[PDB]
Ligand binder design. Sequence first.
Ligand SMILES: O=C1O[C@H]2CN[C@@H]3CC[C@H]([C@H]2C3)N1Cc1ccccc1
Length: 282
Amino acid sequence: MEMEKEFEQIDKSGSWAAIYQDIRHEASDFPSRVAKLPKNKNRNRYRDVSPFDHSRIKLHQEDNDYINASLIKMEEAQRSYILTQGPLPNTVGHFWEMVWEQKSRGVVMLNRVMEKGSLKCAQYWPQKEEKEMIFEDTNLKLTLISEDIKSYYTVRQLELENLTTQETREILHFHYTTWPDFGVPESPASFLNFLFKVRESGSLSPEHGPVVVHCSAGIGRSGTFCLADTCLLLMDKRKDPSSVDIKKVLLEMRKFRMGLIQTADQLRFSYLAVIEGAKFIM
Ligand SMILES: O=C1O[C@H]2CN[C@@H]3CC[C@H]([C@H]2C3)N1Cc1ccccc1
């Protein structure tokens, strides 16, 4: 079926939970043996969210190459994404090592450091120009260059230096700051505006490594971001945009990381975002 009228048909019939449970039942199951090794316990935020072995990002280190991060490679859309958990106190150096080694231009953050009165990720970037951060375990330096605070999101320019080679690179930090502590946004308008700002920066384009996108677990809000982006790109590429099937795209993405889209409300919000976005594109 088309999307907008399939949408109204699920609303009128109140069957979002049944649709979402079908997706959970059909989703791929692949091994995640490296994630579960005892030496990696303090590298995982949640015991039930792990990268598959076949798609995990490897650190360029011989001691321990493990990070909780996955490469989502979308063949028809010609887009790739790295989805990862919010960094932990003992993985902030690994996180920036990955950004460096994978040649990423942009980092997309969809959570606040504290939500619901608890810490959802480490403070992993500097908040003042004159107070830079050094990660001694991976030999990197990170400096805040500029910050632009808007009503729904903040964009930061950062300098990442590999202290071993003295090479430097400019990284863009796109921080969506207004996702509610509970539920999903009422309108997709600010989320879509944010997606378009990430696109306009070049961070999603083939001349760079894959964008790094995270929330707390790296599957819910993060899944909504890449699902909406890929569906909108396919609607622009194909002769028949009504052929784009958001459930099929989501199942394709779940071949590369488990659990993408965590609730039926996130699934409905993803439909809403793609529907409204397709009208603005034209
Ligand atoms: O829904 C939108 O809100 C607009 C505000 N105005 C800009 C033009 C594109 C717009 C957004 C930025 N879109 C559609 C869209 C959004 C993301 C990706 C692909 C298409």
